[PDB]
Design an enzyme around this catalytic site. Structure first.
Site: not given
Lengths: 996, 996
Positions: A197, A344, A378, A403, A405, A448, A524-526, A582, A586, A589, A981
């Site tokens: 991502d 990242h 990642h 990855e 996804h 994932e 991942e959280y918050a 795109n 998003f 972050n 989301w």
């Protein structure tokens, strides 16, 4: 050697070929010919860097490259620096995608229109490196798949961008004067496993080096550690391998230097005939932890029998233990609290090119806010990143570059045993390269990527190779047999999200699952989307309560914003370069901006992640330290007493508390004033001495309590003035001296107020039930029925029309009373009803009581409060309440109650996507220019209206509206922040006092 | 497409490339367009075989092949049949190696002199296969690595000889008339993992087929099974996948046919969008076991919505469960007894080309001798082998083609993560291809290939993909985490062999290891080297006593002998073709010859592996059946009573015993004769009805007991004859009528004996302390100090010289008494001393008592007994004792005491390597021509002397010596047989009676 021959095989479209004549992976080496230079980390002349000015040409397809390349540089070839990326130099537009593949979904086939970066360099070589020895080139990173030509001769082919690729070049190098040719492809087979991502971007984004070694050389060596029960006695396993001709006179030496002093050593000849085991006993070792980065410089020497040194290699080694028992992650015999972050790899002016200054500054900022865990997301990061992590003290969770996804279903690839070669390469090369570092604690097989059989195989391979580290992997519900550390994504605290085959339990339920004993850390959280980081506390409360819940990784650290020139630089997101498809904003972050300016969310994260928790019991204070190995020998508490803002008493108490211990601080006789108001106790822990990552006087933690409160006493309203409100048909005019207030009788709102002559209100005082679009509200809408903003639009709150009513009252004994009500209806359905009461006394103080009722069937209104546009434009805003930074009802934990004063510029936070912001809650008194409002409310003040915030998509497009906009709200919902989301967040009344 | 381009990459010298454009593995398919043809296993026209006459050329190197190949067949190209091997057609000499690599040890580099088989074929194709559909070629085996050219166009590259390789050819095929070009290499990178203890041999050794499929086709399908507690209710999981364009009207149907009758069925559309799950419930299923091969023909149909059939595929499916609990291997809820065998793939006249006739005959012979387990050693076998195994009933232990024994150290390759691609291919392709078959119970990852990390990874991958089968792997001490079924090699029963890091515990100690709960089956045991299979009983006693010890695999089945023409065919071993280095006769370890003539060891194995054990308690007989699911409904006991050979009473009792039950058989009133001798009870279990693998009257088991024995009574020696022995200086001459015996006084041995005039002894009667070289004695000598033959040679037993002594006595009242002694000394040290006593009565009966003493310090003498060469050459040999086949003291279990008569040809077994053989122990009475010897002894009779047996290396070189050779031995050591590289095996007296 011709392209027409080489490219015909289409090796980039074959999952079974991942390397061609590529040398074996190994820890980074410098080939030191002197032990002192090896030990002191001085630069090695054998390692000649090749970063500089190269020659580059772009082509839309590999076949479009003429054969005239491999002999000489093209006339149209430009001069670019390496490491750098051709995507940023305008040759093609980078594209950011979240889920959908930027290329067509058809593995292993990749689009024919494959951009080709034609990098080349002409260089000289010393004959000293040519008459003897082995000379190899090391590419620390080439995105994504590349071929290699040396002096017009084909050398090999490579993949695995995020990891170093090395080839043998002694057999194609000669006569110094030479040319290196590298062709790179934007797309290849590995792009199907390279679906980060992130910005789809290519080039040579890491350093290119030239390493020279003798014929006999040190090949690989793994430095493990084991301890006794009390960690007083430990032994070092410096297993070492070599290559080439084996001579009986060859010897190896492993020497352990605690700085400039040697502690332990050992020597042994060879005998595997190329591997030799050395075990070095160490006593009372200085253990390694995020609090204390103790470093041992172990030097491995390949020396002759008489003692002359052939080659010496060294690696920093720390003494720590990471193991799983009884459901707890133990680090040096103690449980861990992972306050992580997903760093990242991104640079505002170089794309994914990373350098030492940025890396060091990021580590400094991360350690200054109690972040003691990092997850390279990642992919494995730059090799020096891990070295700096060991040097400063930071647990890292390495993540293999896997990855997929967007592939339907998720594990369509990670179960096909034809991709086992590629996945095994991408995992095992990372493991082999990054095993020695002590900071890396947890290997992660991917985010994932879907749970097939390849993940089980690779997990077992890792557990067989390096059993000193737990292996986490989030895919397949994050609870499969391919995972030691249960790591779900965005698992909420109490709310349950039971999805088919990939459910998101509440974290406590996940802990209480039958037959489940492995510890849980949140992958991942918050989500930190601008003014977000919500529920953090809730999250940290759960983390502190539940022993087997061991924290998470706040996603993410740095904002992936690329600089765009209009020539004024403005931060841009996906789709602003013409890229399609795109994923808009998003990609924004970050806890800090791309240029590392701290976001407001950083302060809240810092407060919520503090190592010191405080409990108040009467006069004494209970201080508990979350440190497990270090003593608080560099802290000094500062307690202060303030009554409604004004300080009354303060003092300093140095802190001396054992790890996981408690310290009781007895306060002096605190003042007990008879004045009305609330007494506040603010304690601040300050680090007086500058550390390796902080300055002198660094603030580590702070907390506040409410002391004895004295009910407001005297407050006589009005003096002696019966106001003859000018009753007219169009408005009610009320005049008190030079002050005048006008109340329109057709709208039922305060139209204009006078201070002498000059007007005050550019927009009449009206109620606002709406706030600008919120990332969480939006969710995945652009239409999502469950999105909060979509529900508000369907209910017509944004388009509800105020219908005036009456109840208009008259004057009293010393004042004038106005009572009104309105009905907001959307297509005939009354959404809200509010009844207001306006009270202007003889002293000019205007008290406005509003009682609001809301229909149950409609969704909850965004806000309850008053909005207007003042004519006054003051340079600063003063208030007594929670601050000084902005805060929200669900994120008021970091806010501190005090008399704050900020400039009007600071009243608005520079989020790139405009929205509702600048809010300050718990404001008992407000000051702005001549006016002042008192009570207990929340407000924001800015030069931009909510309508402009909603309409404008970029911050740089915002224009300063005339006057000043005020939104004093009695109540407001939380902003959420569990995920971006889906949603993550009847009868009310507020009392306000208007004065001057 | 040119060779100069293709071979330049040297893909055979790159471990990272194992396939190029090779299609996915899949269970074997026929592409039936009709459900009835799919169900009844009729041949499918879509599967056109291509076996026939091809064109072949040989070259010493791949570069030596001219470019004129790819356009037309070479003038020197010969016409060879495919499948067949160019090594047998004299183009190069095959080489057999055990440990040392036949090529230079330098991975991945292979010798430049790489033989190249230039196979090619010109063929026609129907346009019906070309205008539509997909046409693919399937190579069931190509040793070892090959390229492929279709009509002068390069198609791809392949490896993994022992597994099928398939490529897509629809895009290179057109206009029917076409040419297929295949270049094959003897050596490649995979040869380092292809180090089988077999003939290094190459070619296209398996069938080449042509398969045509429609555009939409069935891709893969796995048929698993689960059961309830009582196995009455079970459900079938016919998970199915497809490929191509997906249409909503597409449907799949799985129909279960118990023969011609359909039992269960189901249908479902697609939706993975290419995978559909069907579950079919089955009641009271006919379970599958080696005793009962119950078969279900499940048909998978790819049919249209209206019902028209596109493609139908079927596979035989059996209902069985294999799982591990409490340390026992349960098959259908019952423990298993693995009486295995290592079937090497070898053919006397076609090398490793295998065909249905040989396969069926091997299965028949294997089931006729109570072998219910097979381990393909060491590679997956022909695809039809597993089908026949399901059809007949035979548990198979598939073995992935991984072998790197010669590499130093063993696991230098299986720990380097650069070979994970190749090892994963070689394991996963086998698993995917052979998962459906129910006979395959245990997946084995290789034979002692060294325990690295790749084996752990692959074991976990297999346990993740197919959890219905235990995974065994013998390497790394056979007790690592990469093994579910502990399978050591040649672990002896009681003797302990503690080797460093790879010890060979006694099997019981291995069972009693701390923390060890997994069951133990012997990976290899009981080497069957000619007259060997020793300790079998000991082994079977341990297997029957210990519950968690579950049998082994007798190595090996078929003798790997190649036919050599002098024109008389003679079996040859390694080194007889001029090959060097070789491993001589170590390639000769078969229970049957190459042409399937049963070895003598086969009978002993059959006896020791019988399913029926018998216990005698007075008159009744206890019969216990080792069957676990089947009832003995096809058996009929035959008991007989014999007194010293002559039958006295017999009867037949039909057997009705439950599985694992007991049956007591009450015998009638057995005769109790007063005649002197030993009564014997022989019981034989006979299968009166012919089965699928046996003929009517098949013998399944037999056993014997000693009944009441009546001591010999009357035996008066001599009549009335005082013999006046002619006392002379050179010999003692004794005459009784026409009979004369001469005793030389200078040697002390019987020189000549007369029957009238004709002479009887061609060699004087002397003692023999030696036996010919024994494989076990030899061990790994050619010099090994611990080898038994080497110890005997060092002690000088073979060169001990008899020194005559005296004690010579004289005549008595009715006879003549001779008493002598000799001293055998080697370099002055007396090894043995024996004192003989010769007694010729008046009836002509000669009694010889010999008392032998042996020095303790010398190694144990090979044999104690008399040797001579008789002048008589009779056509048959008659004896009363153990037989009729040869037997040894350690392998006398299968021998039966009875009066046997055999021709002199049967008295010698045709072992290719001559040695001591033809021995018959427990012979109380011997008859050969006119003479007869009585007592209790062991003997062998043959036309070849022990000296000729020692000197001659091949059987076909043996020449019949004059007269007949006799070796009547009182005592003899065992032959051992635990292993063939180490030993595996004071005062004595014997009494013999010579008569006529």
């Amino acid at each position: 050697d011709s392209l027409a021959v080489v490219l015909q095989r289409r090796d980039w479209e074959n999952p079974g070929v991942t390397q061609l004549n590529r040398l074996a992976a190994h820890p980074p080496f410098a080939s030191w010919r002197n032990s002192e230079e090896a030990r002191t980390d001085r630069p090695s002349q054998q390692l000649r860097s090749l970063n500089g000015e190269w020659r580059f040409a772009w082509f839309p397809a590999p076949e479009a490259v003429p054969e005239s390349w491999l002999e000489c540089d093209l006339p149209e070839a430009d001069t670019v620096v390496v490491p750098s990326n051709w995507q940023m130099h305008g040759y093609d537009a980078p594209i950011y995608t979240n889920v959908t593949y930027p290329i067509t979904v058809n593995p292993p086939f990749v689009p024919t229109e494959n951009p080709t970066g034609c990098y080349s360099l002409t260089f000289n070589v010393d004959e000293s490196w040519l008459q003897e020895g082995q000379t190899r080139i090391i590419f620390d990173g080439v995105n994504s798949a590349f071929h290699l030509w040396c002096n017009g001769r084909w050398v090999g082919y490579g993949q695995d961008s995020r990891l170093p690729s090395e080839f043998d070049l002694s057999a194609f190098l000669r006569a110094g004067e030479n040319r290196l040719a590298v062709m790179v492809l934007r797309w290849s087979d590995g792009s199907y496993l390279e679906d980060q991502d992130m910005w789809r971007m290519s080039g040579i984004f890491r350093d290119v080096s030239l390493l020279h070694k003798p014929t006999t050389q040190i090949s690989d060596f793994h430095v493990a550690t084991r301890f006794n029960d009390d960690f007083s006695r430990a032994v070092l396993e410096a297993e070492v391998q070599m290559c080439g001709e084996l001579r009986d006179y060859l010897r190896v030496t492993v020497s352990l230097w605690q700085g400039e002093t040697q502690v332990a050593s050992g020597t042994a000849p060879f005998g595997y005939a190329d591997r030799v085991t050395l075990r070095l006993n160490v006593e009372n070792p200085k253990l390694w932890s995020a609090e204390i980065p103790n470093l041992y410089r172990a030097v491995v020497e390949l020396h002759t029998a008489d003692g002359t040194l052939i080659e010496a290699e060294a690696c920093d080694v720390g003494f720590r233990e990471v193991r799983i028992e009884n459901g707890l992650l133990l680090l040096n015999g103690k449980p861990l609290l992972i306050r992580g972050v997903n760093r990242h790899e991104h640079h505002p002016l170089h794309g994914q090119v990373m350098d030492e200054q940025t890396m060091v500054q990021d580590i400094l900022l991360m350690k200054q806010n109690n972040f003691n865990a990092v997850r390279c997301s990642h992919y494995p990061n730059h090799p020096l990143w891990y070295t700096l992590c060991d040097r400063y003290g930071l647990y890292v969770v390495d993540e293999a570059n896997i990855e997929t996804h967007g592939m339907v279903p998720m594990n369509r690839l990670t179960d096909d045993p034809r991709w086992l070669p590629a996945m095994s390469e991408r995992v095992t090369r990372m493991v082999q390269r990054d095993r020695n570092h002590p900071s890396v604690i947890i290997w992660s097989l991917g985010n994932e990527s879907g749970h097939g059989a390849n993940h089980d195989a690779l997990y077992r391979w890792i557990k067989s190779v390096d059993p000193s580290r737990p292996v986490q992997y989030e895919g397949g519900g994050a609870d499969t047999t391919a995972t030691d550390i249960i790591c779900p994504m965005y698992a909420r605290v109490d709310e349950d999200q039971p999805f088919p085959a990939v459910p998101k339990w509440s974290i406590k339920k996940w802990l209480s699952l039958p037959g489940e004993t492995r510890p849980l850390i949140l992958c991942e959280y918050a989500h930190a989307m601008g003014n977000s980081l919500g529920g953090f506390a809730k999250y940290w409360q759960a983390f502190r309560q539940y022993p087997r819940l061991q924290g998470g990784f706040v996603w993410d650290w740095v904002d992936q914003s690329l600089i765009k020139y209009d020539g004024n630089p403005w931060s841009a997101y996906g789709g602003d370069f013409g890229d399609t498809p795109n994923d808009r904003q998003f990609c924004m972050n970050g806890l800090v901006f791309a240029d590392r300016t701290p976001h407001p969310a950083l302060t809240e994260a810092k407060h919520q992640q503090q190592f010191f928790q405080f409990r108040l019991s009467g006069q004494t204070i209970e201080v508990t330290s979350e440190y497990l190995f270090r003593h608080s020998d560099n802290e000094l508490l500062h307690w202060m007493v303030a009554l409604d803002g004004k300080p009354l008493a303060s003092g300093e108490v140095p802190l001396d508390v054992a790890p996981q211990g408690k310290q009781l601080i007895e306060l002096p006789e605190l003042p007990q004033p008879e004045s009305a108001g609330q007494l506040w106790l603010t304690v601040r822990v300050v680090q007086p001495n500058a550390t390796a990552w902080s300055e002198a006087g660094h603030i580590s933690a702070w907390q506040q309590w409410r002391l004895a409160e004295n009910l407001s006493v005297t407050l006589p309203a009005a003096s002696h003035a019966i106001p003859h409100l000018t009753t007219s048909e169009m408005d009610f005019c009320i005049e008190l001296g030079n002050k005048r207030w006008q109340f329109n009788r057709q709208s039922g709102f305060l139209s204009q107020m006078w201070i002498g002559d000059k007007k005050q209100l550019l927009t009449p005082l009206r109620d606002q039930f709406t706030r600008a679009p919120l990332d969480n509200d939006i969710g995945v809408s652009e239409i999502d029925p469950n999105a909060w903003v979509e529900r508000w639009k369907a209910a017509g709150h944004y388009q509800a029309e105020a219908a005036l009513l009456q109840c208009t009252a008259d004057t009293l004994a010393d004042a004038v009373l106005i009572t009104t009500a309105h009905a907001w209806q959307h297509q005939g359905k009354t959404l809200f009803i509010s009844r207001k009461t306006y009270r202007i006394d003889g002293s000019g103080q205007m008290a406005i009581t509003v009682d609001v009722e809301v229909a149950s069937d409609t969704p909850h209104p965004a806000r309850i409060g008053l909005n207007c546009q003042l004519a006054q434009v003051a340079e600063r805003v003063n208030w007594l309440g929670l601050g000084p930074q902005e805060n929200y009802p669900d994120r008021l934990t970091a806010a501190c109650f005090d008399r704050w004063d900020l400039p009007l510029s600071d009243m608005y936070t520079p989020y790139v996507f405009p929205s509702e912001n600048g809010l300050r809650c718990g404001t008992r008194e407000l000051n702005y220019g001549p006016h002042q409002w008192r009570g207990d409310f929340q407000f924001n003040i800015s030069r931009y209206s909510q309508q402009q915030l909603m309409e404008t998509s970029h911050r740089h497009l915002l224009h300063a509206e005339e006057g000043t906009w005020l939104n004093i709200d009695g109540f407001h919902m939380g902003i959420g922040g569990d995920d971006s989301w889906s949603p993550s967040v009847g009868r009310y009344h507020y009392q306000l006092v208007w004065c001057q």
